[PDB]
Design a protein around this ligand. Structure first.
Ligand SMILES: [Co+2]
Ligand SMILES: [Co+2]
Ligand SMILES: [Co+2]
Ligand SMILES: [Co+2]
Ligand SMILES: [Co+2]
Ligand SMILES: [Co+2]
Ligand SMILES: [Co+2]
Ligand SMILES: [Co+2]
Ligand SMILES: [Co+2]
Lengths: 70, 70, 70, 70, 70, 70, 70, 70, 70, 70, 70, 70, 70, 70, 70, 70, 70, 70, 70, 70
C-alpha cells in the first residue's frame, strides 16, 4: 500500500507532477511545479495511488530509468 | 492487493489506460488519456485488479519491458 | 491468494482470456477479448484462481516468457 | 497454502489437468481439457493441494521446466 | 511509511531541503539549510511523505545516485 | 422504459452487441456474439438503457435503417 | 414490456428460436424448433426480453420484413 | 397482454393451431383442428403467449398477410 | 382485453358462430345460428377469447375482409 | 366495452335490431323496430356485447359499410 | 362511454330526435323537435346510449354522412 | 365530457346559441346572441351536453363544416 | 378541460377577446384588447370554457382557419 | 396545462413576449425581450395560460405558422 | 413537463444556449457554449420551461426547422 | 423522462458522446468514445436530460437526420 | 451593502438597467427602462450587488465618469 | 441606507420626482411635482432606494452636477 | 469585507468576468459575459473575494485605471 | 483583516500568485495562474494574510505601483 518511492528530476522549467486520488472515484488531489534542476523524492501514500508527470524530466523507479518529454 | 506498480510512457497522441474493478462483477471503472511523451506510474489497489492499455506505448513491469502497438 | 500478476500481449485479433472461479465449485466467471496489439496486466484475486488463454499471444510471468498458439 | 502457481502449455490435442482435494481424505476435485497450443496458469489454493498432468505438455514451475510425455 | 532514507551532500553554499506533510492536505512542514560540505541522512516518517532539494547537491537513494544542479 | 426494440442482422462473422447498465453509474452489462446471417431482436428494459454494436451489421429501428461497418 | 409480437416462418427444416431471460442476469430460457413451412407468432413477455433466430427464416416485425440466412 | 388478434383460414383438411402457456416454463396448453374453409379469430390473453400453426393456411396479422405451407 | 369487434354476414342458410371460453381451460361457451342475408356485430369480452365460423360467410375485421366457406 | 357505435338505416318497412346481453349467459335483452327511412345510432355498453340486424338495412361501422338483405 | 357526438341538420319542419336510456332496461328518456334549418350537436352521455331520428335530416358522424328520409 | 369544441360564425344579425344541461333531466341552461360577422368558440363541459344553433350561421366541427340556414 | 389553444391575430385596432366563466352560471370574467398586428395564443383552462371575438381578426384552431368581421 | 410549446423568432430589435397569469384573475406574470435574430422556444406551464407577442416576429405552432407585425 | 426535445446545431463559433427555470419566478438557470459543428439534443424537464438561443444556429423541433442568426 | 432514443454512427475515429445530469444542477455525468464505423443507440433516462456530440458523426432522431462536424 | 450610489443618464432612447441579486446564487432581479434625457440615481442595497447598463449612457461613480456605448 | 441626499431644482413647469421602494419587489411609492424654480432636498431612507427624475432639471450630488432633459 | 466596487467596460465582444469563492477553499462561484460596450459595476460581497477578467476591457478601481488585454 | 485589495496584471505568460494562511502556522493555501494580459483583483480576508507574486507583473496597491521582474 505504501513504502515505495519515485525520484523525479526536472530537466526544464515548469514541470508538473500530479497526484491522483485513492478510492472508488479518481480525481486530481494535488500538483507540484518544479524548476530546472529540482529533484523531488515522492512516496506512495494512503491518499495517492497514481502519479502523472508533464514536461521534460528524468525519472528513477525500482524498475529502472525513464525520460518523459511531455 | 497493493504495493506493486507499472510504468507507462505514451509514444503517440491518444493512448488510453483503463482500470477494471475488483469484485465478482467486472466492469470499467475509470480511464485515462495520455499524450505523446507523458508518463504514468500506476498502482494496484483494493478497487483495481486489471489494467488495459490501448495505443502505442512503452510499459515497464517487474517482469520486464513490453511495447503495445494498439 | 493475491499479489502476483501476469502480462498478456495479443499478437492477433480476437484473443480470449478466461478466469475461473475460486471455491469448492469451478466454472467460468469472466472473460476478456483482446484486439491485435493490446496488452493486459492481470492479477490473482479472491474470486479468481486460474487463467486460461485462447489464441496467439505472448505471456510474461515470474517464471519467464511463453507463447500461446491456440 | 497460496501464492504459488504453475504454467502448463498443451503440446498436443487432449491434455488433461486434474486437481486433488485438500483435506483428511484425498479425492478428485476437477479436471480440465487443453487443446494443442493453449496455456493454463493454475494456482495452489485451500481446496487444491496436488495437480496431475496427463498428455504431452510443457510445464514451468519455480524449480524450472519439465516436459510430460503422457 | 518508514524504514527508508536518503543521503544528501551539499556541494555548494546554501542548499535547501524541504519536507512535505503526510495527510489529506499537502503543506510545507520544515526546511533545512546545508553549507558547503555537510551531509544529511533523512528518513521517511509518519509526518513526511515527500522531500524537495533546491541547490547543487549529491543525493544517494536505494535506486542510485543523482545530482541536483539548481 | 419499455415497449421499444431494435433488429440487428449480422453481415459478417463475429459481430458483437453490448448492453449498458441503467442507473446512476454506467457500466457494461452483457455482450452477445452473432455469426454471419443471424438475427437478434432486442428490447429496451429497466436494466438496459444503451446498446452498442461492433462489426459489419444491418440495423432496423423506428427511425429507419442503418449499417454499421465496425 | 409486452403487447408487441414478431412473425417467423421457417423456410427450411430445423430452425431454432431462442428466448433470453429478463432480469439482472441473462441466459437461455427456452427454445423452439420449427419444421419447413411452419409459422410462429411470438410475443414479448415478463420472462423474455430478447429473441435469437438461427437458420433460414422469414421474419415480419413492426419495422418491416427481414430474412435470416443462418 | 391482450387486445391483439390473428385471423387464420384453413386451406386444406387437418390444420392444427397450438397455443403456448404464459410463464417461466413454456408449454403447449391447447390445440384446435380446422377443416377446409373454416376461419378462426384468436386473441392473445394472460394464458397464451405464442401461437403455432401447422398445415396449409392463410394468416392475417397487424403486420400483413402470410401463408403457412406445413 | 376488450373493445374490438368483428362483422359477420351470412351468405347462406345455417351459418354457425361459436365462442370459445376464456381461461386456463378452453371449451365451447355459446353459439349462434344465422340465416341467409343476416348481419351480426360481435365484440370480444371477458368470457370470450376466440371465435369460430362454420359455413359460407363474409367477415370484416380491423385487418381486412375474409370469406369463409366452411 | 364502450366508446364505439354503429349506424343503421332502414331501407324497407319492418327492420328488427336485437341486442344481446353481456355476462356469463347470453340472452336476448331488447329489440327495436325501424320503419322505412329511420336511422339509429347505437353504442356498445356494459349491458350489451352483440347486435343482430334482421331485414334490409344499410350499416356503417369503423370497418366500413355493409348491407343486410334479409 | 362518452366523448363522442353527432351533428344533425333538419331538412324539413318537425324532425324528432329521441334519446334512449342507459341501463338494464331501455325506455324513452327525452326527445327534441327541430324546425327546418336548425342544427343540433349532441353528445353521448351517462344517461343516453342510443339515438333515433325521425324525419328528413342530414347527419354527420365519425363514420361519414348519412341522410334520414323518415 | 370535455376536450371538444365547436366554432360558430354568425352570417347574419341575431343568431342564437342554446346550451342544454347534462343530467337525468334536460332543460335549457343558457343562450347567447351573436351579431353579424362574430365568432364564438364553445366547449363541451361538465354542465353542457348539447348545443342548438338558430339562424344563418357557419359551423366547424371535427367532422367537417356545416351551415345552418335558419 | 385543458391542453387546447387558439391563435388570434388582430387585423385592425381595437379587437376584443372575451372569456366566459366555467360553471353552472355563465358570465364575462375577462376582456383583452389587441391592436393592429398583435398575436395572442390562448389556452382553454379551468376558469374559461368559451371565447368570444369581436372585431376584424384571423383565427387558427385545430379545425382550420376562420375570419371574424365583427 | 403542459406539453405544448411555441417557437418565436424575433425579426426586429426589441420584441416583447408577455405571459399571463393562470387563475381567476388574469394579470401580467413576466415578459422577455428579444433582439434581431434570437429564437425562443416557450412552453405552457402551471403559472402561464396565455402568451402575447408584441413586435415583428415569426411564430410556429402546432396549427401552423403566423407572423406578428406589432 | 417532459418528453419533448429540440436539436440545435452550431453553425459558427460561440453559440449560447440558455435554460429558464420552471416556477412562479423565472430566472436564468444554466447556459451552454457550442462551437462550430457541435450538436446538442436537449429535453424539457421539471427545472426547465423555456430555451433561448443566441448565435447562428440550426434548430429542429416537432414543428419543423428554424434558423437563428443572433 | 423515458421512451425516446437517438441513433449515432461514428464517421471518424474518436467521437465523443457526453451525457448531462438531470436536476437543479447540470454537469458532465458520463461520456463514451466511438471508433470509425460504430453505432450507438442511446435512450433518455431519469439520470440524463441532454446529450452532446463531438466529432464527425451521423445522427438519427424522431425529427430527422443531422450530421455533426465537430 | 449600502451607502453607495451611481448616477446614470440616458443619452438615447431605450436604455436598460439591470440589477443582480445578493447571495450564493446570482440571477437577474429587476430591470428599468430609460428614455432619452432621463436620469436615475441608484443605490447598492441588501438585495442588489451588481448593476449592468445596456445602451448609450453616461455614468457617474465615486471613481469618475464613464460612458457606455451600447 | 441613510445620511446621503440629492438636491433637485426644477427648470420648467411640471417636473416629476419618483421614489422607488426598498425591498425584494420594486415599485413606485411616491411622486412629487415641482414647478419652475422650486428646489427639493431629498434623503435616501429606509423606504426609498432609487430616485427617478422626469423633466428639465438641475441636480447636485456628491459626485457632481448633472442636467436632466426628460 | 464589503463596501467596495470595481467598474468594468467591455472593449470587445465576449469578455468574461469570474468571481472566486470566499472561504477555506477557492473555486469558481459565478461568471458573467459582457458584449462590446456594456458596463458592469460590481461589489465585493460575503461570497466573492477575488475577481478575474479575461478579454480586452477597461477597469476603474480606487487605485486608478487599468486595461486588460487578455 | 479585510477592506483592502491589490490589483495584479500579468505582463508575460505564466505568472503565479500565491496566498498564505492566517493563523498560528503559515502555510501555502492556494495559487493562481495568470496568462499574458489577465488582471486579478484580490482582497485580504480571514483566511489570507500575505500574497507572493512570481513572474513579470504590474501591481497596484494603496501605496503606489510596483513591478515584479522575476
Ligand atoms: Co498548478
Ligand atoms: Co475520456
Ligand atoms: Co464472449
Ligand atoms: Co470432461
Ligand atoms: Co385433437
Ligand atoms: Co346450435
Ligand atoms: Co314530442
Ligand atoms: Co420590459
Ligand atoms: Co460561460
Amino acid at each position: 500500500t505504501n513504502s515505495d518511492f519515485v525520484v523525479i528530476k526536472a530537466l526544464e522549467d515548469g514541470v508538473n507532477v500530479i497526484g491522483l486520488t485513492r478510492g472508488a472515484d479518481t480525481r486530481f488531489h494535488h500538483h507540484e511545479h518544479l524548476d530546472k534542476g529540482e529533484v523531488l523524492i515522492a512516496q506512495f501514500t494512503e491518499h495517492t495511488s497514481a502519479i502523472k508527470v508533464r514536461g521534460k524530466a528524468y525519472i528513477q523507479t525500482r524498475h529502472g530509468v525513464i525520460e518523459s518529454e511531455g
